[PDB]
Design a protein around this nucleic acid. Structure first.
Lengths: 233, 71, 111, 154
RNA sequence: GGUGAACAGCCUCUGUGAUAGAACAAUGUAGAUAA
C-alpha cells in the first residue's frame, strides 16, 4: 500500500506548490518516497514503469496550468482509473504553523500511517441517474480506502495510531450540486482524564478540491464523468 | 469581515473529526476487551485444545463486537 | 448528520468489512472476484463477451459498455487486476508460445 | 547388566502421526530438523513465518544452492529456501498433537518437541516418480524438578 | 422474466485449452501491410 506524490509539472510548478507537494508527501509517510527527486525531465511513462519494481500502488500528481490553476491527479497504478481534481483553495503546512499558537513539531507521530475518515461521501439521497450518481461515490470511496494500509482490531496497538486525516464532501451547501472535498490532517493527542480524551492538533495542508473528471486509464481512455461536458450516446 | 467566521466553521468540523476518532477508538477497544472476556470463556468452556476452533470462534466474536458498537 | 465511513479493516482471514462498517464480505468470495490467469483463457473470455455483445440491440449496448467500464474501474480500484485490453492479450499470447518454441529447440537438442 | 533409558511416561507425553503425506521427503526432513527440540509456541511461529516468506529454512544435508540471504546468519548455513507445503503439513501435525495433549490434560504452554522423525512413503506409481513421506512426532512437558527434604539423623 | 448500477451476486451438468504469485498484461526492440 505504497504511493508516490510527484510534481508532474517538472520544476516549473512554482515555489508555492513545490512546497505543497512536499507537504502532502510528508503527510502521506511512510508509504512514500521522501527522497524522490522530481527532475525537469521525465513524464508519466517514466514513473509508472518504475513503480511496479518499486511496488508503488497509487500516484498523486500535481500539475499547474498555463493559467496558474492547480490540479491534482490521483491515479491507481498502472492502468487504473485516474481521479482528476481541481485545487480551489489551499494553504501550506507552514502557513498552519504560523496561525497556530503552539505548533507541535513532528515527533514519533509522523512514522505511523494515519487514520482515514470519510464524511458525507455517498448515500444521502443521490440518484442512479443524478448529476453525481451513487455509482461514482462508491468508486471514490474505495479509491481512498485502498490508499491506506488496513487496520486490524486484534494486532494494531491503539498507541501506534496517532494521526487522523479528514476528508468531507460539501453537501452542506445546496449550491454545491457537485463534488467538492475538504482535506485536513490532525495529530491525535490523548489526555487521560480509565477516561481518556483525544484532542487534535492541526497540521495541514488544507485542501479544497473539486472533481473535474474521471478517466479509465493513465491520462487516456474514455472520460467516465465530466461535470461540464455531457457526451451524447 | 468574512475571514474570522471561518475559524468557527473550521472549529465546527474540527469537532466532527474528533467524533470520528472517538468512534473508532472505543469501537476497536470494545472489540478487543469483549473478545478477551470471550477468550477466557473458551478456557472455561471445554474446547479441546484445537487452535483452529479457538481462532475461528475467537475471530467470529471479534466480528460481532465491532459490528455491535458501530451499528 | 454524518455517516462516517472509515479506512479498510481486516480481521484474520482477509474478510474486509465495509466503508459503512455494517456488513462484510469474504476473502474467498474475493477470489472469484479475480478473473482468469491463463492468457489463452483470457482471450476466449473477451471474445465470448464480444460475441454476446453482438447479439444485442443498440440501446442496451450503451448501458452494457457504460456499466462494464465502471465495473472494471471499480474492480481495479480495489486491487484486482482487470485484463480487458485485447491487443495486450494476443501480445501476451504471442510471447507464451515463444517460450514454448524456445524450450522445444533446447530440449530437442538435449535428446 | 545395562538398562536402556526408559520412556517418559505416556500421560506426560503426546503423540501425533502423519502417513502417506503428498509432500517431498527431502524438504520435510530439512524442515523438521530446523524445529527439533524447540518449544511448541516457538515452532508454530517459525513455521507460520516460513509460510509468509519471512524466515527461511536452512538446507544442510539435502542442500541445494538456491538462495543466499542474510536470514541464514541465525543458522550459520549459506543455503536457504522457503518450504511452504512442508511447513503446512508440519503445522497441522503440531496442532494435532496440541489437541491430543489437551485431551490428555497437559499444560499447553510447556510442550517441547523431543521427537520428530520423517520416513519415506511408498512411491506413487504413475518415468517420473513422486516422493511422499511419513511423519511422526512426540511432545512432552518440560521436566519438573522438586526440592529435597533435609535428611534426618537418627 | 433470464447478469446488466452493481459499499450487489456470478448455481448445476457438459469434453477443446491453460502450472501459480510477482514481474504495467515483464520491459520492450525492429521490419513490413493494394488499412
Amino acid at each position: 500500500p505504497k504511493s508516490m506524490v510527484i510534481r508532474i509539472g517538472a520544476g516549473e510548478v512554482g515555489t508555492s506548490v513545490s512546497q505543497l507537494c512536499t507537504d502532502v508527501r510528508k503527510v502521506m509517510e511512510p508509504g512514500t518516497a521522501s527522497r524522490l527527486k522530481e527532475r525537469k525531465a521525465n513524464r508519466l511513462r517514466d514513473y509508472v514503469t518504475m513503480c511496479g519494481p518499486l511496488g508503488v500502488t497509487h500516484l498523486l500528481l500535481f500539475s499547474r496550468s498555463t493559467s496558474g490553476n492547480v490540479n491534482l491527479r490521483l491515479v491507481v497504478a498502472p492502468r487504473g482509473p485516474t481521479f482528476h481534481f481541481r485545487v480551489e483553495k489551499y494553504s501550506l503546512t507552514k502557513d498552519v504553523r504560523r496561525a497556530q499558537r503552539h505548533p507541535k513539531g513532528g515527533g514519533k507521530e509522523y512514522m505511523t500511517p494515519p487514520l482515514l475518515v470519510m464524511n458525507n461521501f455517498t448515500d444521502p439521497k443521490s440518484d442512479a441517474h443524478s448529476k453525481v450518481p451513487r455509482h461514482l461515490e462508491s468508486l471514490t470511496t474505495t479509491a481512498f480506502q485502498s490508499l491506506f494500509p488496513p487496520i486490524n482490531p486484534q494486532t494494531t496497538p491503539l498507541k501506534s495510531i496517532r494521526r487522523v486525516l479528514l476528508l468531507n464532501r460539501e453537501l452542506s451547501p445546496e449550491n454545491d450540486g457537485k463534488f467538492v472535498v475538504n482535506f485536513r490532517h490532525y495529530l491525535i493527542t490523548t489526555k487521560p482524564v480509565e477516561r481518556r480524551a483525544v484532542k487534535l492538533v492541526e497540521l495541514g495542508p488544507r485542501m479544497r478540491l473539486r472533481m473535474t473528471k474521471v478517466e479509465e486509464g493513465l491520462c487516456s481512455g474514455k472520460v467516465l464523468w465530466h461535470e461540464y461536458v455531457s457526451k451524447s450516446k | 469581515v468574512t475571514t474570522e467566521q471561518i475559524i468557527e466553521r473550521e472549529r465546527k468540523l474540527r469537532k466532527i473529526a474528533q467524533r470520528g476518532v472517538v468512534k473508532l477508538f472505543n469501537a476497536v477497544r470494545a472489540a478487543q476487551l469483549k473478545a478477551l472476556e470471550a477468550e477466557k470463556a473458551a478456557r472455561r468452556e471445554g474446547v479441546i485444545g484445537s487452535k483452529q476452533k479457538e481462532e475461528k470462534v475467537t475471530e467470529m466474536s471479534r466480528k460481532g463486537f465491532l459490528d455491535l458498537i458501530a451499528s | 448528520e454524518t455517516h462516517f465511513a472509515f479506512g479498510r479493516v481486516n480481521f484474520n482471514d482477509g474478510t474486509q468489512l465495509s466503508h459503512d462498517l455494517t456488513y462484510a464480505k469474504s476473502a474467498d468470495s474475493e477470489k472469484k472476484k479475480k478473473g482468469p490467469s491463463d492468457p489463452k483463457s483470457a482471450l476466449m473470455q473477451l471474445e465470448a463477451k464480444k460475441k454476446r455483445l453482438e447479439a444485442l440491440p443498440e440501446e442496451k449496448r450503451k448501458e452494457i459498455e457504460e456499466k462494464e467500464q465502471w465495473l472494471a474501474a471499480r474492480r481495479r480500484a480495489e486491487g484486482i487486476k482487470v485484463h480487458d485490453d485485447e491487443s495486450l492479450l494476443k501480445k501476451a499470447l504471442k510471447r507464451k508460445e515463444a517460450r514454448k518454441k524456445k524450450s522445444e529447440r533446447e530440449w530437442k537438442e538435449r535428446i | 547388566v545395562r538398562y536402556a533409558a526408559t520412556e517418559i511416561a505416556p500421560t506426560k507425553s503426546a503423540r501425533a502421526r502423519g502417513s502417506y503425506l503428498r509432500v517431498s521427503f527431502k524438504n520435510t526432513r530439512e524442515t523438521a530438523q530446523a524445529i527439533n527440540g524447540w518449544k511448541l509456541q516457538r515452532a508454530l511461529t517459525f513455521l507460520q513465518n516460513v509460510i509468509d516468506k519471512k524466515e527461511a529454512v536452512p538446507m544442510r544435508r539435502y542442500a541445494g544452492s538456491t538462495g543466499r540471504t542474510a536470514q541464514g546468519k541465525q543458522w550459520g548455513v549459506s543455503r536457504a529456501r522457503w518450504p511452504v507445503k512442508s511447513a503446512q503439513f508440519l503445522i497441522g501435525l503440531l496442532k494435532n498433537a496440541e489437541a491430543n495433549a489437551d485431551a490428555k490434560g497437559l499444560d499447553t504452554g510447556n510442550l517441547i518437541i523431543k521427537h520428530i522423525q520423517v520416513n519415506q512413503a511408498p512411491k506413487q506409481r504413475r518415468p517420473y516418480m513422486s516422493n511422499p513421506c511419513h511423519i511422526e512426532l512426540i511432545l512432552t512437558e518440560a521436566e519438573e524438578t522438586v526440592q529435597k527434604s533435609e535428611a534426618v539423623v537418627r
